[PDB]
From Swiss-Prot:
Binds 1 zinc ion per subunit. Keywords: Carboxypeptidase, Cytoplasmic vesicle, Disulfide bond, Hydrolase, Metal-binding, Metalloprotease, Protease, Secreted, Signal, Zinc, Zymogen. The keyword Oxidoreductase does not apply. It comes from Sus scrofa (Pig). Residues 6-300 form the Peptidase M14 domain. Its EC number is 3.4.17.2. It is an enzyme of class 3 (hydrolase). Transmembrane segments: none annotated. This is Carboxypeptidase B.
Length: 304
């Protein structure tokens, strides 16, 4: 049984992608953008009412296997779209005018592994030459100052960059999709945990994007909007100085493709529970996060 207020295993999320699509044909379609190392279909939901020449926002969750609140959030976003479409003015406008691509779990193989073997797994589950150590950090595997700062060359390490940029089937699949849809995708949102942040480029070097002032102001406003609900405090800014320098991330890569609004979200908490955020916090976390995501969406829609 699927529930939006619990963490759902992959079999359940997969079945949910099929069911939520079938139940909402005028709002949702489903495709597979590729397969994981283990051969699992990487599902993508396109959320929006059909219309001509629609811009798009792309959002993924579940890069990192143990960040279960991320996976829960993508599901919550779709929950909100289907529940409130027609009833609530902003969500209705968003879905009438834009498409949202929601990739509920990128690193499916790692997610399954966190359910079956090791709750604290981070990386993919692919093999590495010359060692029995498993996996690549998908957020160190993009062509963005690849494998320099904040990324490890050691396959046994948690920030292993991989054998080459896009070596992983999952990150190749994501990069291919974004490249193939570059003319329509106006914003890229990538959901992680924890530490309560809205981050924008750059992380791969200490340098700033040309629209730094715009991104800074937008992140600042989205943080303030998030805080209105429960008082949850987020920090914000360029990744390198706001969290740490780290190369090969998808946010920086997407920005360097020309996607001008590119954000990494770090959801709750600030370390009390860390990755093992209790299910009792799913609702509040997702509801406040919705406010920030909708704020960014409204900004994008209003500044085309
Ligand atoms: N480093 C880039 N490009 N963006 C920020 C990503 C932050 C993210 N933090 S986490 N979820 O603790 O692993 C990461 O290090 O990949
Ligand atoms: Zn993460
Ligand atoms: Zn709600």
């Amino acid at each position: 049984g699927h529930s939006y207020e619990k963490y759902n295993n992959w079999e359940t999320i997969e079945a949910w992608t099929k069911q939520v699509t079938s139940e909402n044909p005028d709002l949702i379609s489903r495709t597979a953008i590729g397969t994981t190392f283990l051969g699992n279909n990487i599902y993508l939901l396109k959320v929006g009412k059909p219309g001509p020449n629609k811009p798009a926002i792309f959002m993924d969750c579940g890069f990192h296997a143990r960040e279960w609140i991320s996976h829960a959030f993508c599901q919550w976003f779709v929950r909100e779209a289907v529940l409130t479409y027609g009833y609530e003015s902003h969500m209705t406008e968003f879905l009438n005018k834009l498409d949202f691509y929601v990739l509920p779990v990128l690193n499916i193989d790692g997610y399954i592994y966190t359910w079956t073997k090791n709750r604290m797994w981070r990386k993919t589950r692919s093999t590495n030459a010359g060692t029995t150590c498993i996996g690549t950090d998908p957020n160190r595997n993009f062509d963005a100052g690849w494998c320099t700062t904040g990324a490890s060359t050691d396959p046994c390490d948690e920030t292993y960059c991989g054998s080459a940029a896009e070596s992983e089937k999952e990150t190749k699949a994501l990069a291919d999709f974004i490249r193939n849809n570059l003319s329509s995708i106006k914003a890229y949102l990538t959901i992680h945990s924890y530490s309560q942040m809205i981050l924008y480029p750059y992380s791969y070097d200490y340098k700033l994007p040309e629209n730094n002032a715009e991104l800074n102001n937008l992140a600042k406003a989205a943080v303030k909007e998030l805080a209105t609900l429960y008082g949850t405090k987020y920090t914000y800014g360029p990744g390198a100085t706001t969290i740490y320098p780290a190369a090969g991330g998808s946010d920086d890569w997407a920005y360097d493709q020309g996607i001008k609004y590119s954000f990494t979200f770090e959801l709750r908490d600030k370390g009390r529970y860390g990755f093992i955020l209790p299910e009792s916090q799913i609702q509040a976390t997702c509801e406040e996060t919705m406010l920030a995501i909708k704020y960014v969406t409204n900004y994008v829609l209003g500044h085309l």
